[PDB]
């Protein structure tokens, strides 16, 4: 079927992970990766993030009922962290 992948990303020198997001509970569209910036941290980790990946958890947090702006803040918040690491549980088709 579809399946879950856990992806761990450390941001680059500018604090960017290298992907774009669309969706959120206010957008009436699920949260989904709309871009992978080539050679970015999100493109070079193993396993890597893919365009079209559906975001399920952000650092363990179920984000199904959070807004677009909220989840962008949750992602930025992972840089101000223990390991600076962002952990994305995603769903892939």
């Amino acid at each position: 079927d579809s399946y879950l992948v856990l992806i761990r990303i450390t941001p680059d020198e500018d604090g960017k992970f290298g992907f774009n997001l669309k969706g959120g509970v206010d957008q009436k569209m699920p949260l989904v990766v709309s871009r992978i910036n080539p050679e970015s941290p999100a493109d070079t980790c193993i396993p890597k993030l893919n365009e079209g990946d559906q975001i399920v958890l952000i650092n363990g947090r179920d984000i199904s009922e959070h807004t677009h702006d909220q989840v962008v803040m949750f992602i930025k918040a992972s840089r101000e962290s223990h390991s600076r690491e962002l952990a994305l549980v995603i769903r892939r088709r």
């Binding site: 960017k16 992907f19 774009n20 669309k22 957008q27 871009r35 992602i75």
Partner: peptide, 8 residues
């Protein structure tokens, strides 16, 4: 807008 796209 309900079609926002944000860079992370």
């Amino acid at each position: 807008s309900q079609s926002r796209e944000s860079q992370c």
